[PDB]
Amino acid sequence: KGKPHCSRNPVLVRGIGRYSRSAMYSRKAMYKRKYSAAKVLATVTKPVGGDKNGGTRVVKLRKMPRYYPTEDVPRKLLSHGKKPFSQHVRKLRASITPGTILIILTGRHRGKRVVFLKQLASGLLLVTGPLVLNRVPLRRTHQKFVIATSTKIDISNVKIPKHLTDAYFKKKKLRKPRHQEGEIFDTEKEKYEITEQRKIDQKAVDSQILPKIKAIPQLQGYLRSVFALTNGIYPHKLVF
Template identity: 50%
Template structure:
């Protein structure tokens, strides 16, 4: 028994004169795993620990939604008028179209509006190796990238007979050889529409001309020949000024090919 007025004695300190340290709080959950999928407490034990039995069958009442009035009752004067009438708070439209209007849909991103991601090795002036098409195996000079993402290349035509063409970047290999074509002026009309074929409408054939079918062969127009000569002259002048012009002309004029044992993914071009 402790007498009234007696002072309480503080807890005994340790031999070193310090109070015993408090246990650090463990941040682990109450029911943690002991390993191999075994938990400290079973599902039944946790059911009672969390007092889940209190909530079995308990249902909370949903709050009632306030219904907004749509009509207002107004008195009507006069005989044989019913005395009252329901009037809409929100009036309906006075005009309804006979056909449904065209709904505006979000515009699809067309191919012409796509962002073109070009490989960083495909810079203007880089010598490329063509891998597909009529001129596959030839080495050409990259002039620029067009709006559609296709590459504008040229042989030059006097070196390897490859004219101005559009090539997809998938079908080329970029080499380490690069020419300085910053001063080359390409005609402004050389764009994607420039390479579109113009097909003429054939007249209706009579009975005797059914089997007289002639295949139309492609012939370059005078405009293309003129543009080809302008571009080739500028590129040839750049190559001639290069101290290694002989090796560059020989490199552009030769065809690319692989021999047995040569692995393209281990070669440096």
């Protein structure tokens, strides 16, 4: 075997390489790389033991089904696309760059102005309008439901902790093991608890974002306020 190489055919447009068939033939040196000519055990033998039980037993793995349904469904055709969500390419709007002030449009933090940090692996934005300013913790949000404003702070050379991932922010549930019929109320644990780790992470990020917020005048007052539509103003005439 040999070490893998880069593509040697730069892309210039999606689906079209920069070099032709003969150009890539010479780049690959295909003139000298010419080739003409030169498992899993389903059953296992196990010593059964015991006198006059024979020697061993040819025990097979994956025994045949005990039961068959009265009728089945035919298998699907093949689609040559339709990747799973984890393999989708994640797209981010050009107006959303790290440090941009965003406006939340949905949720309990509706209308608040927060600070954008990074896009996560699922494409959800990680924001923290710092908790001391407008009570928005380190929290995920969707880029489709935010407004990217023009004002930005340079949050370069700040250290977002690496464990802050999609798995970190994914919701946790309790119900429902060891319980089938509800005769005693299972309303306990409905109080979500803020982990000490989440408080530590909130303090760590905000300790290095807050000094940069105070660097420009009355930005903290801007972040403390909420966005609203006055009767005179129209969102299509507003420069954000």
